[PDB]
């Protein structure tokens, strides 16, 4: 394993504790609400991703390379990749813990697909099934954690952000992480000459699914259907 990939794996959060805190927050603010005041299933998912955004920010906040940029550069990177990290984390959770016909939430709760599908609507189901199709290919490619953290840093240190005062590091990490992933998939996965290319090509698809998820959630917010998640959705 390249030592750069080892450095990326250290900034990974304590997932059992992240899931425990999010579940406790929702179990609090849900059983606390009145009978005529319970959250909808779409509302529960919005609060889950809102809490997930908090741990996403704290993850990058203490991650290597990222903790060297000034706060202005940190905000620009996160405001460009926040929905992609949510989709990437959701997709990887279904690759690891996922079972067929089931969706695993950030709280560790397993939901059957056809129940969520009845309430997601036309657009979300197409966005969810497209993401589930990406889960199927990543599963067939043996998508592991070492390649998951590099894809996270490739999304975080996106070349699609500007007004950066230190674009040299963002560009430097992008090329450097890309070279480490190419070396990892080659050394640890011969047999699969298609894996490295197939891995990077999900990024435009994750970028497209996430950007289409933003435009629908913004559509839902203007209709009065949805607060860190909302402030990230603006501008």
């Amino acid at each position: 394993i390249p030592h750069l990939i080892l450095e990326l794996l250290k900034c990974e959060p304590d997932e059992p504790q992240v899931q425990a805190k999010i579940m406790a927050y929702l179990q609090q603010e849900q059983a606390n609400r009145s009978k005529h005041e319970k959250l909808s299933t779409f509302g529960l998912m919005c609060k889950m991703a809102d809490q997930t955004l908090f741990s996403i920010v704290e993850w990058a906040r203490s991650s290597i390379f990222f903790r060297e940029l000034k706060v202005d550069d940190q905000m620009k990177l996160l405001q460009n990749c926040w929905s992609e990290l949510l989709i990437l984390d959701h997709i990887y959770r279904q690759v690891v813990h996922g079972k067929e016909g089931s969706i695993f939430l950030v709280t560790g709760q397993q939901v059957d697909y056809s129940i969520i599908a009845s309430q997601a609507g036309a657009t979300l189901n197409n966005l969810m099934s497209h993401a589930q199709e990406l889960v199927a290919k990543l599963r067939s490619l043996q998508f592991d954690q070492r390649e998951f953290v590099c894809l996270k840093f490739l999304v975080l240190f996106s070349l699609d952000v500007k007004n950066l005062e230190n674009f040299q590091l963002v560009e430097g990490v992008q090329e450097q992480v890309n070279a480490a992933l190419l070396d990892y998939t080659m050394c640890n996965y011969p047999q699969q000459t298609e894996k490295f290319g197939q891995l990077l090509l999900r990024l435009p698809e994750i970028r497209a699914i996430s950007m289409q998820a933003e435009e629908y959630l913004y559509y839902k917010h203007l209709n009065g259907d949805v607060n860190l998640l909302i402030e990230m959705l603006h501008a």
Partner: peptide
């Protein structure tokens, strides 16, 4: 975004 800057500046 005051909330995002706060999450990156708080202790």
């Amino acid at each position: 975004n005051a909330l995002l800057r706060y999450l990156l500046d708080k202790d």
